[PDB]
Design a protein around this nucleic acid. Sequence first.
DNA 1: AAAACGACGGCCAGTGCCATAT
DNA 2: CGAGGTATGGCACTGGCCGTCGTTTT
Lengths: 974, 411, 399
Amino acid sequence: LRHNPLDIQMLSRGLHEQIFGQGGEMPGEAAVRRSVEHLQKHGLWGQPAVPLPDVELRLPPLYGDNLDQHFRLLAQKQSLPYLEAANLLLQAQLPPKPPAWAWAEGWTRYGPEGEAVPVAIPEERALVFDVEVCLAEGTCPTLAVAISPSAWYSWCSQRLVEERYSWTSQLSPADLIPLEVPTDWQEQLVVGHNVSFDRAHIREQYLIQGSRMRFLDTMSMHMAISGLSSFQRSLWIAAKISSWDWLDISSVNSLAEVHRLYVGGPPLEKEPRELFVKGTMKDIRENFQDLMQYCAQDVWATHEVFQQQLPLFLERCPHPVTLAGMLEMGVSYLPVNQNWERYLAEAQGTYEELQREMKKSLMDLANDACQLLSGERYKEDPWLWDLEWDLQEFKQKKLGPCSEEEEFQQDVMARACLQKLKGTTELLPKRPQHLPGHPGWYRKLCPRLDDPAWTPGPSLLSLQMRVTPKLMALTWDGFPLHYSERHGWGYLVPGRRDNLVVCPYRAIESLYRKHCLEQPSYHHGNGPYNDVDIPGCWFFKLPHKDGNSCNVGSPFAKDFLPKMEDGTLQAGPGGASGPRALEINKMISFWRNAHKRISSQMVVWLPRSALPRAVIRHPDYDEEGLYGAILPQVVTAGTITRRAVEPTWLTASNARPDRVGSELKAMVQAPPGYTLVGADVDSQELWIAAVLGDAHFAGMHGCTAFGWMTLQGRKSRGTDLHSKTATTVGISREHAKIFNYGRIYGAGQPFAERLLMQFNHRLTQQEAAEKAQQMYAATKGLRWYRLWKGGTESEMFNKLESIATSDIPRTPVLGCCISRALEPSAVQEEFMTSRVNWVVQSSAVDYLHLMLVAMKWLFEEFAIDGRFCISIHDEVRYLVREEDRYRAALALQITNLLTRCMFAYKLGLNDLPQSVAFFSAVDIDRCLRKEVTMDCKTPSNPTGMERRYGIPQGEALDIYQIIELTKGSLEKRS
Amino acid sequence: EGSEALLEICQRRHFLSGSKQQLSRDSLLSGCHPGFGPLGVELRKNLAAEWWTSVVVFREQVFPVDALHHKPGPLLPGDSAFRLVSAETLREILQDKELSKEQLVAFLENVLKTSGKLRENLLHGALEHYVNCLDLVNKRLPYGLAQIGVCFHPVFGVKSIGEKTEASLVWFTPPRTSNQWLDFWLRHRLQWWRKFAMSPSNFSSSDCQDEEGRKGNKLYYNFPWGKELIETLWNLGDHELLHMYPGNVSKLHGRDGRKNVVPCVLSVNGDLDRGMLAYLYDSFQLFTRKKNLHRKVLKLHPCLAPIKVALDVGRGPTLELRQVCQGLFNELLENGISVWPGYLETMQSSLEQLYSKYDEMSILFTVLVTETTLENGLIHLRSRDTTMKEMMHISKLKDFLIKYISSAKNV
Amino acid sequence: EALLEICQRRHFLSGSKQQLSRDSLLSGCHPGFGPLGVELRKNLAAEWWTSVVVFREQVFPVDALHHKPGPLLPGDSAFRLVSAETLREILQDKELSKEQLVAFLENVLKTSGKLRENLLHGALEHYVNCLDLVNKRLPYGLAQIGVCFHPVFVKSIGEKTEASLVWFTPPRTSNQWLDFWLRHRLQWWRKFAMSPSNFSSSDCQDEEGRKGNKLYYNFPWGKELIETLWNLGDHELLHMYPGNVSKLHGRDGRKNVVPCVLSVNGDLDRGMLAYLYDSFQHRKVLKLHPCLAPIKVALDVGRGPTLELRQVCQGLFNELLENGISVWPGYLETMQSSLEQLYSKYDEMSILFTVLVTETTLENGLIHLRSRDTTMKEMMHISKLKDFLIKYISSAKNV
DNA sequence: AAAACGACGGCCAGTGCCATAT
DNA sequence: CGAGGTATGGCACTGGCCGTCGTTTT
Ligand SMILES: Nc1ccn([C@H]2C[C@H](O)[C@@H](COP(=O)(O)OP(=O)(O)OP(=O)(O)O)O2)c(=O)n1
Ligand SMILES: [Ca+2]
């Protein structure tokens, strides 16, 4: 109606009547009294708040009798054809493999009796498809094998049969596998192992206009049915922590293991030589038959795995929404233009430049170090004394004169004299010796002369090497650094006179005494690990942000930057050397880690002929530019929670002022005439947990204190629960997210206090510990009552524990069953934290599936010319036509509303608070970025997106502005 | 200060020239110093070659240009610049009553409008040759002209003229891309300067404006006494082109894509004398272990070091060692490595003093031949960077050095 | 003549047709060379430096300024700088005017400087300081290349780039050291000449009795002096350092002696023109010696997909550049004109070879190669090309 | 003249620590 | 009785196994 028994604003009369009916039973006296008592106990009662403006809209028809039936009908409508195709596959009958494989390029279909016939494309509703690619030749697919009911198909790349000196280095749609039918029936289904990689090599997938084709991955269904955590994956391997009944029913994601688990039978042999990874094209040409046979073997194994898998997946996730959600989640798509190439250059060069400044600074030091060899002076150095100062021997076997005109002989007589002496190969081994004169430590840093990538000097040195800190003479509070094998990095405090090639303790004591002029232990830290024998000193581990258990692998870790700023960590040369090195390291860490993936991204450039007419005629169109696409290789369900997994795009960093290459996502630029419209779910899992607790306790929104608090506040006013925590503790809102979510999922108080000390530099151990103690006591009180009972969030913890402890845990909203490898009967009380977190994480996955289903339904309802661009857990982005973009802005909002109501419907609550009714603001932009306003300044492009690339600002619009621009309608012309 | 030692070393090893008094900071910066010694000449040649390689060799739309050292013909009045006249004509003018009363005071106007001046910038000749060089690339608008030469500047007989070796590049571009090209060239030139620098942070850049409001960037090197300008970038626009070719403006345009637009001019001018001085200061490097290894040496980049190899003879039969050293020296020169023939020098110092001398001269490698080199093909080698001795077969020596330098470019 | 038309058409000479003339080129008052002329002059200077300075331990570079300040000898033929700052002071006060203005001319010699007429004086000024570089080993030389200013009869100013070698030798063997050089220099010109006969040497006598030699090249109009060798004795050394001669001594024969000075001066602009005429000797082709030709090879594209051929040509361009081979990127025009016209244009530019990358190069890597001299077309594997080119250079250097 | 008998790099797999995302 | 969770990937280092080739024994 307008306000609930607890004076919390709810959905307006019109929308509430459109969503919920009047049949909802009013809570009884006892429930309301309990809720009022609970709110009074926490001091949340008697505080009115200003209501938000009402929203009036007339939603499209909702089929069925309630939200659940409507969503079920929509999901079934979406997923019927693909399920039909899968069932057709289950009954497939195929003959054995052909006697011999064909050599022609293109597609060949093999009939009975081994006859091979050329075909344009496989004419099937469903397939099991696999592709092998010659890595050394780049990324162009090499060959492929497919199987359909009553048919085998083999595909040969044109580059495999023909011989040419060179091929185009830029991928084109003309050199990819044709695997779609022009305008039986529609909505083909493709099955395979790691199907995203196979999809990446299909010409038709890169067209901007969407296609019906969808993909099912046997790996994803294995994860859903009998998946294993990363810890479980590691433990399952090496089986060749206290319960083991789950091993017999689970396996890793490798195809052979899955085949063994699901059908057993004889094992699957591998190709011994791995020609597709090691060999060249000639190796493939000569070993064609064996490679094609192995491909057919893999395809048949995947077919058997899918046949044995599908019924179990249908049983353990009965809700039709999950299947359609996976199908729509498996069709990610990213646009890009020529700027991407420039980006690849601009970062790399920049990286190199920085890497040139860094290495140089180190290399010089190395060059200056060799002199210490003289007189054994290195024995006095408090850093490099422990290195190998070897000296290998070179190895062997066994007057007023006038001018002249006769110098022509003096020339040749000299030259011949040399030509003879160069023949002295008698005493030289055939294998050249490597820099025996130089010390061994220096030699390790020098590439071998025969190395094709040889460069002068110790060009191999880097910050991550254990010697680099030694060369830089790094110091911690006036104490030099040292590396213990057991305990990682640390520092040496001199003065240990009880003997606590030998350590030059005097050269450390003198240095510390000199340092002290500018200001059984006498210093406090990680404590002296006496097992590290270093006479004259104590070894103290460098503090780690994750506690004393972890060991420091490098002082140049980003978390140590503030210590440089404060001056606790110093460099021997002084000045900005240490700070500059750390700044370079922080700038280039992300690129150093991810450049192999980013530069190797498969980019296909679409020719002008195949581009949409809406772009070829747009005023902002740009001739002579490039317009390509990248299809993210997403594993539809790569985790126990069934989240999507990918190496690149689920790890790409957000644009930052200093991080080189941080504008990766900014390079995803819509073509002229197209826009990116999207949004993020606000406080998703926090709200899910709060509503679960509220439903458990008294079936009323806000009955629990946590549910009461999560609804109050506004993001714009900095009064939401995340912002409230951030202001109470004094940190950023992202740090508040981390702090809250850690505690939600069983983080201990030590973890919370250590995290607090990491961000709020003002705090000490005492204050952080006290804050953590008070917050934990408030959020969840004592766990025992008979010699979680109290606390605002106690009901939520109890509900999650109860759901996890069920003999067959299921998602409260959609009922998807947890993997067999984690049911209580198979694991008893093992992997408890993962099982508990799985409830909420799979609830979020169901939220994502529901949002995708709603978006697809809304786009289909009004013939909107948009498509799903990408999803990152809760973040959703869609590529839309500009003229229709505003309509999309509403389609998202309504979807959110539906996803909010449906979530409550399965919990027994017949209303939705107005607070979480809509998104904070839907984003409309030309490129993907965390917020529209940022211009993405970076060392890779200091001028930002506005000048170098010309991309202007986006805009964030809330519900009211969207309604104004749409007047509440969604039709093409109102 | 600490800069006295650098100048003393440069004087001893003939990097500079003249007396100590003539080599003050003001004379060095102004360009009125006597000149450089042979080592300085070789260092400047190496720097010029590297600049040419980085700016001209690897670009399809860059061409050389040669601008004369004087500006003849009429000049605007009042500039008070020197004038060119021959002493052969310093008497015949006033002979026999040519208005010999008071009009000789107005003869200054004649001095202003009867003789030319010395070239002050390389930009003027490049602007003059813009039209001629437009014909090379069928008027393709993006194209450059580069030059290196000496220029004269008045300095405050009470005033004199200083000579400066400057490298100038003029880049004609589409007007719309003018600022993007300005940023690109700023970044590229700064990268080039940092490349050879041991401490590339001492080079820095700043933004600058002036009366006309045209954007500018300037590059400074941080000498011990402060930041000193070494290079400038100006986005002039098209005013100079119009003024030199007024009226028939139609001829000034060039092809920008399908359009035909007037070019925009970007000017870059670096000082090679200041560049050499800055590189010398950087190499000399004006930490407990660093102070304990105070070896006087100029760590000039291998691509910039005037001398690469030092060759001498060991004790033994002088004739055979001399013959083999002659052959080795000839081969090293033939492949293209500059060598210091120490084998011809008489013996007056130990090995340590000879090593010190070669370090001050900044020689990359020292090659030593002895009796063992006749017994077998092995010779001794020493590297400037590490001071570590090694043994190497003679036959491969020519290759190794060729590799080293060739890889020094891509470290 | 046709040669000058070709030079103007192919950016060897700068300035309008109204400006270029024989007298202007000979005197040195011409507007200047074009980029091709600059490249050819650079190649000539590099060859001269390698021949004279590189392979000799007793020859060193020297740096001489373009002007000399201070009091100077009056009443002669040489450019001088009129006082600059004085032009700002006289315009506010008159010194009575009239017949004391003659002294103004004298005042010119009090302050006015002078430009550089030759590198000999700078070398002589350096001599004393630079003798320390050889431990006073008397026989040694100083080499330089630089621009000099010469009046041309209001006097005009001509600029000539010249290479100068100053050789200090003991008086006894000096006359033998002269002829020695007279041979080598004469050989050097013959090294790159298609007709070495046209270079000649002559003996000359000085009014003081000192003999010398002059090197001439026979242009179509006559024999022009391209280089000169003079034996001068100790006159200039004594004059430049009057007084105590002790510091002018050098150790020859393990005894002190005052060296004799030999001056070798060659005009690099006149040499440039001489080689231009020599290499121009039934089509307009400039057969410049491969060691001197500014541009070695020309690169182009055939008919087919532009992107692939352009990528291949850019790769080949970088490969050839990295090996020290100058390349003219003709592939940016895509054969918008006939092929024979392109061949003629490249022949006029004196490009040794023309390489045509075609669609078939993608299939098998075969490339069409044409030579400047033999003019015979060939098919070659692209990977080979680089090495082959290098050999064709080195061979020419040796033969 | 044949062929043991070793050192000495190449190469790979496995482990540890750090960096990203949500 | 108490744990943050799920994913991806990079470089640095270390242990072991194997193929050359140049001393040593037949
Ligand atoms: N360090 C993190 C970051 C995220 N998550 C999970 C739970 C979060 O609910 C989900 C999405 O987090 P956002 O970054 O999208 O945060 P919210 O959706 O909670 O906040 P906002 O209102 O900024 O969307 O990812 C987590 O467990 N630990
Ligand atoms: Ca969110």
